[PDB]
Amino acid sequence: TELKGALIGCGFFAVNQMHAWKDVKGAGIAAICDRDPKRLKLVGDQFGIERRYGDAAALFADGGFDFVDIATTVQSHRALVEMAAAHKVPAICQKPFAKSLSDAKAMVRTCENADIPLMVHENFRWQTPIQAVKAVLESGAIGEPFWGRFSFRSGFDVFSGQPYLAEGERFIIEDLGIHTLDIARFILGDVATLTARTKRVNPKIKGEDVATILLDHQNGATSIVDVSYATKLGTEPFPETLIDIDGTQGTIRLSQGYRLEVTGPNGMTISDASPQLLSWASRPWHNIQESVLAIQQHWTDRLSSGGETSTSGADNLKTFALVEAAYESAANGRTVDIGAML
């Protein structure tokens, strides 16, 4: 009955994906793969996976799975997606999708030629509060949107769980802004032009931890995407994205604690848009953790019905172009044309 998955990269975040695969209806994990045998045993023993591999090439050679879930760091994404396409195995790939837009496009083209689905595991838009904002806007409750702010400002120690974040020359846009830019696209549509500024505040890291981005959307809306991992607040908001939308007939204000305020022609409503806390989830990650179940169930449903996923490889190019444009803009000082990159 169930689709049989193979997960590659049994790291920090993969533990969440494994829990979710148990919960997903119509799919489960039949095999795992990791370069590190300490991680291979730890995850293998925790989830009771009999089939365990030290390298992906051997995994693919044995086969016996219907899809692959790639939860490695960015360095091995291109090779693993290319291995999947050559073996005709539908593939999920973690963010950041690739090291460059050029690599991403090549990965998309290879999967399109192999006639296999490719979904980027881009789960921020699958969060309950973000879904709620989308539903309000699509309902026409505030009319046509003309302005947005999408803000993730945190002082959370992401570096403990994910030490590589402190080492790269590139940090926040590639790691976190990739989500916030995707949310901006999800809510207000594709971007025409982009302008960005960056800064490093934290002395203990190599790369930028503050980014401010100004988006000119194709539909005429303007938005601000502002991200920071050097923001010291009284109440730590991690991992909440706060959202303001202004429209011709109203406003949406998603504020701290998942408070969703909507003003329209017929007054003003307030609702709790907080996530469900799953049995295996853990504060403060529970928002992200629920969205892992949401996107993996989405993948599983779309693989059966044969439709395109929401954050497909093809879709995600238009998010990834913004990340690369933001770095270009921050260095050059100039506004970047997004259409010309694609």
Next chain:
Amino acid sequence: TELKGALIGCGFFAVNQMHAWKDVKGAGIAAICDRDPKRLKLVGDQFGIERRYGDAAALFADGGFDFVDIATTVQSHRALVEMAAAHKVPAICQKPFAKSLSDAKAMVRTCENADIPLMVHENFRWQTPIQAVKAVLESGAIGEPFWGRFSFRSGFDVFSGQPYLAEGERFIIEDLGIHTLDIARFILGDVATLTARTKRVNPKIKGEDVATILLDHQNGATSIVDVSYATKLGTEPFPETLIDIDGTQGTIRLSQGYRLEVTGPNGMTISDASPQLLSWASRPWHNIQESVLAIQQHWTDRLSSGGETSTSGADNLKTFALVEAAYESAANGRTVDIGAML
């Protein structure tokens, strides 16, 4: 000794300036001037002013005053400042200072040549909550500021009291953004480069009612100035400017209802930064109305002691440049160098 003022432009907003001049210690109004004799009659009778002039030329010829308060619309500012300079009368001039940066510079030059003070009545930085943000940041409570947001988003019918606002090709940056940009300078210092976007949402007006501006400050800080008169919120925030500042050791958050959250190395504090309610004030103008008294007392103190004012003509050029740069940037789509304009 009591300083004697002449006020020119007995319009909508000048009634507030007249109330405030009564409350000011060390100064009062001895003469008024307006081309419209209905306004001259109404304001003259209300405030008991015997000396009433149909034109400024005659007012200056008769003299008998130590300073002039110009509360007309922008069209007549340059001429009235020039008349003040030639008659060696210290001058206050309402915003917008001039029609262009070029006119503003000439006005500043003429007053410097005549050895008379020139202050722009730029009263937003003189609001109690804005003064509190400045005082917190100057104290060192949050370390060195690196990022800010300054936001004035409203659905208030400013067009009732000020109908001309609906008629101009230019609207919100010139009318309101001029204040918000001044606050950005006041808090985070002078600006090196600037990028702006504008649009018109309201179908009943000629000019732009939404503007979003990205500032690169000379000290390294980045800020967003976002203004709108087409924002429909459950609670109308007019005329509050909301302010976020991030620093190396903390944050300032000035939110709706004048609530001031400051978090630093010691902990979080919440303060009530609400304005006073003067005897002659009216909701919802009371915050602005208090600041009119503050700036007019400031003028009076500085004129009496021979100091320079905070929003002197010379200082205000660095605000006004940002307004002209924002219009330029919004039309061309290009980043504008502020230094090159001054």
